[PDB]
Amino acid sequence: HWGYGKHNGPEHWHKDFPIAKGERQSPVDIDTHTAKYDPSLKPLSVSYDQATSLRILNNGHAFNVEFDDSQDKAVLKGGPLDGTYRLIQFHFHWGSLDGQGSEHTVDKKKYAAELHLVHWNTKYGDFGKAVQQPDGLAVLGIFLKVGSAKPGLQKVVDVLDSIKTKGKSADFTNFDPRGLLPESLDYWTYPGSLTTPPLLECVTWIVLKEPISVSSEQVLKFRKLNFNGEGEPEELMVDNWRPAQPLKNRQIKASFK
Ligand SMILES: COc1cccc(N2C=Cc3cc(S(N)(=O)=O)sc3S2(=O)=O)c1
Ligand SMILES: [Hg+2]
Ligand SMILES: [Zn+2]
């Protein structure tokens, strides 16, 4: 149903998902001058050393690397969070050109792509319960800029050939998500939602200020993915991002000054 085309893109979402015009929708523009430094903000605790990746699959919207979240293998704690959040999957949003692709912007600036490491609040038992809570999910957002190649990203880039079309999946075990992290864990944080339908407002967004760079050839491989399934007319998977939403009654807190 929903997609990123003129006929079923972000502008049409509200018809099937009314929360699209809700009070805490993401992504948002991060205005750095009016964001508030908060000294009571704890540092992030990202423990991804016991992470266990399982699959990589094209879902017609993006490609997702899924992880085993049956136990606290890769968790997120600290920062503005209270409780442990488990990594269940990560995905990217990218554009058809280097000047677009990220969902969140910084002072209106768009990056080439954006990585979202999705975590769910373990106090809720399972992911399905978590998406029914205002503090059910924590998504770590990381910006990707085009520059030098990101070593930890190549393994993902290589397997894209086997998951070109919608519905395809491939085994993708022993992948270390720590290769996708910037050097600094400084961040901005605000209450928001999923950036794609069902557009649920259960997310505490933690967007890192430091982006990671990837070569144009690495992000180039992203653009050869297909929205369509095999045997269907080809649709390049590009621009799978949602425009910034009004901040409304919200303030973005910074962990740095
Ligand atoms: C009942 O809601 C469900 C159930 C199962 C999966 C999802 N998901 C859908 C979209 C979606 C978009 C995300 S983003 N771009 O904001 O980080 S994270 C995410 S999801 O958790 O994978 C929602
Ligand atoms: Hg929710
Ligand atoms: Zn996303």
Brief write-up:
Its EC number is 4.2.1.1, 4.2.1.69. With 257 residues, the chain is mainly beta.
How would you portray this structure in words?
The chain is mainly beta. It has one domain: Alpha carbonic anhydrase (Carbonic Anhydrase II), CATH 3.10.200. Helix content is 7%, strand content 29%. It has three helices and 15 strands. The chain has helices at residues 127-130, 154-159, 216-222, and strands at 29-30, 36-37, 44-47, 53-58, 63-67, 75-78, 85-94, 105-106, 113-121, 137-146, 169-171, 187-192, 203-208, 212-214, 253-254. Strands 2, 3, 4, 5, 6, 7, 9, 10, 11, 12, 13, 14 and 15 form a 13-stranded mixed beta sheet that branches. It binds ligand AL6, mercury (II) ion (HG) and zinc ion (ZN). Zinc ion (ZN) is lined by residues 91, 93, 116, 195. The modification Phosphoserine is found at residues 162, 169. Substrate binds at residues 195-196. The active site is at residue 61.
